């Protein structure tokens, strides 16, 4: 074989069913990257509410019709005002947690339509102005209500009082990539002719073992209608969509006074 000896001392120089959680119960699931949520490994005492925070919280129901273009949420932003989980978030400097997301949508055998649910790590969205990275904290953290997609890019032509809001586009996924490839991310498809619910399990993903839960969002959830809703020969159709999220294996550290962000 060919001979090789490394000269320098540095390595760089070298040549190259029912699910019950806590006091909540909901009656196949998808695990992101095949990794179940877990606590920090062996390699300041953390606080861990075993059941006061690891349970299912239900968000506000939304309506799906013939003109809906999609919805998106950010985690852990969406759960900032849910029981003691939010209190622990705002009373500590460092936090960590995984999630279990459950999407519910029921219809009849005479309806038709398909929804795509995508879980995206580090889901960064585009703005609505010539200025770059000018979106504000308040607009980037809607909370429980979340946001919506659009079919076109509407530039905010107002220099007097810029809105500083996102302008996602459905077929660009709001980030400049084609929607067809979004299936690279963890995903589920709800087809009304086969099923009525979707489930995803998300572990903690980040470049650090633990990070602030207030200034950084680890996950994004996007729901988009792949096929339009229809029902018999009716002009208008509307059905509800519900989202339920459960924290799992949550840890907090850095206890001090409480944080009170200015949301408008």
């Amino acid at each position: 074989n060919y001979t090789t000896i490394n000269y320098y001392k540095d390595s760089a120089s070298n040549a190259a069913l029912q699910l019950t959680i806590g006091n909540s119960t909901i009656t196949n699931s998808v695990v992101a990257y095949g990794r179940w949520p877990e606590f920090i490994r062996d390699d300041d005492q953390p606080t861990e509410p075993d059941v006061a925070t690891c349970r299912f919280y239900t968000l506000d129901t939304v309506m799906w019709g013939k003109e809906s273009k999609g919805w998106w949420w950010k985690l852990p932003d969406a759960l900032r005002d849910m029981g003691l989980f939010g209190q622990n978030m705002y009373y500590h400097y460092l936090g960590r947690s995984g999630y279990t997301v459950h999407v519910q949508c029921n219809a009849s055998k005479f309806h038709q339509g398909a929804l795509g649910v995508f879980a995206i790590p580090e889901y960064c969205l585009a703005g609505d102005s010539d200025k770059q990275r000018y979106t504000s904290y308040a607009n980037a953290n809607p909370g429980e209500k979340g946001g919506k997609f659009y079919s076109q890019f509407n530039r905010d032509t107002a220099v007097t009082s810029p809105k500083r809001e996102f302008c996602p586009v459905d077929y660009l996924l709001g980030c400049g990539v084609l929607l067809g490839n979004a299936f690279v991310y963890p995903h589920q498809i709800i087809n009304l002719r086969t099923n009525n619910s979707a489930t995803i399990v998300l572990p903690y993903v980040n470049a650090m073992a633990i990070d602030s839960m207030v200034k950084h969002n680890n996950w994004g959830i996007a729901i988009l209608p792949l096929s339009p809703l229809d029902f018999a020969q009716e002009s208008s159709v509307e059905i509800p969509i519900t989202v339920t999220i459960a924290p799992m294996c949550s840890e907090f550290n850095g206890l001090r006074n409480v944080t009170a962000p200015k949301f408008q």
Binding site: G34, R193, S227
Partner: protein
Amino acid sequence: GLPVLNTPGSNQYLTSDNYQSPCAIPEFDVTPPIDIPGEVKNMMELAEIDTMIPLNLENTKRNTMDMYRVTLSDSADLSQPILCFSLSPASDPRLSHTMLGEVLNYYTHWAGSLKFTFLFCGSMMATGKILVAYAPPGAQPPTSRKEAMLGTHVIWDLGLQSSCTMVVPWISNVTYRQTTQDSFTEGGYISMFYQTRIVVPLSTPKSMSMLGFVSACNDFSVRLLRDTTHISQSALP
């Protein structure tokens, strides 16, 4: 000292070379890594993931969500094909911008089998049968079911199953095919036809949508890395 003789190629810079160079920051304490989910070892792993195909690239539907949907109806002409395209994973416009196509556009040669999936998004009360056919190159592209059924084909029942899968195997004269358009390395054709028609009862929608996905198999390989044409630049920041 030691006598030496300089050979051709001295003092040149080849961007694909692999040599050793001094380190400008000696004795650096590197931060240890952690186990982060989602590690990737090979680019082919990305090409094995199914992604939607923008089948409908009509003028008024391209660059829009509707380009991912193919219409089906109970009153369609049963003698005409539903969709047709060519087996050019990297050069065909309907396959070039998929994840498989994006990966292939960084390489010059490709080989292996492909997997196509079709999803039916109608009501539970709709029924029908479809024929999905692949034809190797050499003859006229099929224009009717009689010609298509002579090649490789699969019959799909919508009522029993809402999704169908067809595997296009590797059949070629050369060991590797080019990622660009070339008649000497053409791959074949893919077509779809109605075996039976779509039947729905009363108080049910008569029109529905169908989706398509493509992926690679474990016997897929690429060769001769090269730059892509999907990104350009006109000015430096």
